[PDB]
């Protein structure tokens, strides 16, 4: 299992987050009208994963904002805000700002996501949240960038998830 | 299994919604602190269910503002609402209208009070939410009453909830 820390105290945190260099594992997840969307609906594009605990508390927010103007900057890209509140509480911030680039994506009916990308917390109030983490896919579904965010209340590294889209 | 419509259009709902003179069962759902709640918890009160498929969607808002007013007019009675929604939405809302009677309660973590209160949507978009609903349970955890709303859309029935609390 792996571990993050809130202010400094340690959550666990379920299998491992996937290791650039490995094939990334399929999933559904649900958009903001209740339909499933699979990792290969996007066949072709690179993916930015953007996970996190929850889009109402802490830093989420912060990162959904600035990955929104980073999708405007970078081709051929989807980036995808994932977490386990319900559609309409990701749509609603999206909404209220304006923030049109993004896909939200729910794991409510889909917690096997967060077991399968090594995001799960596992013990603990948080249990049943993701932990926030950034996952990056190439074109033909190769994880090339994760980061679990040590520090769970600290925005994750845009610059490093971005670095390996660039030429 | 039931079945509740939206606009007309038939929904699946698991099980059975209990029957007045049934013995509640119990659970545990998640309180706005992420601490894990039971109804033996409530021990010697009345309780009322306000079930709902989400705050950030629909009547649901609605009904929980109706019943934190209906809270302050009855005795020796918690007024717990439930949903799918994660905490957080549940109580952003109900921090910007400062509605402060209620309990919000969430089954993100316990899917299974889901399908033993027979709220489950079980098929289509919805599937995951609960349906829409209101259970009344006694001090000795007897159900008094229960509605499941037929009309997902519409608000349910607030005085023949309250009835049963009356002389």
Same mark, same amino acid.
């Given at each position: /299992?792996?571990?993050?820390?809130?202010?400094?105290?340690?959550?666990?945190?379920?299998?491992?987050?996937?290791?650039?260099?490995?094939? $990334?594992?399929?999933?559904?997840?649900?958009?903001?009208?209740?339909?499933?969307?699979?990792?290969?609906?996007?066949?072709?594009?690179?993916?930015?994963?953007?996970?996190?605990? /929850?889009?109402?508390?802490?830093?989420?927010? $912060? /990162?959904?904002?600035?990955?929104?103007?980073?999708?405007?900057?970078?081709?051929?890209?989807?980036?995808? %805000?994932?977490?386990?509140?319900?559609?309409?509480?990701?749509?609603?911030? %999206?909404?209220?700002?304006?923030?049109?680039?993004?896909?939200?994506?729910? =794991?409510?009916?889909?917690?096997?996501?967060?077991?399968?990308?090594?995001?799960?917390?596992?013990?603990?109030?948080?249990?049943?949240?993701?932990?926030?983490?950034?996952?990056?896919?190439?074109?033909?579904?190769?994880?090339?960038? /994760?980061?679990?965010?040590?520090?769970? =209340?600290?925005?994750?590294?845009?610059? $490093?998830?971005?670095?390996?889209?660039?030429?």
């Amino acid at each position: /299992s792996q571990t993050v820390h809130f202010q400094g105290n340690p959550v666990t945190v379920a299998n491992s987050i996937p290791q650039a260099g490995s094939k $990334a594992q399929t999933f559904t997840l649900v958009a903001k009208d209740l339909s499933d969307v699979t990792l290969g609906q996007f066949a072709g594009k690179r993916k930015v994963l953007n996970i996190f605990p /929850s889009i109402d508390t802490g830093v989420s927010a $912060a /990162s959904v904002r600035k990955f929104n103007q980073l999708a405007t900057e970078i081709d051929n890209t989807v980036v995808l %805000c994932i977490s386990a509140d319900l559609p309409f509480a990701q749509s609603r911030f %999206c909404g209220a700002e304006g923030l049109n680039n993004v896909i939200t994506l729910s =794991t409510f009916r889909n917690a096997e996501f967060l077991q399968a990308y090594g995001v799960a917390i596992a013990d603990g109030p948080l249990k049943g949240l993701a932990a926030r983490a950034v996952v990056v896919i190439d074109e033909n579904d190769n994880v090339i960038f /994760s980061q679990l965010v040590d520090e769970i =209340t600290t925005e994750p590294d845009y610059e $490093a998830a971005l670095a390996v889209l660039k030429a």
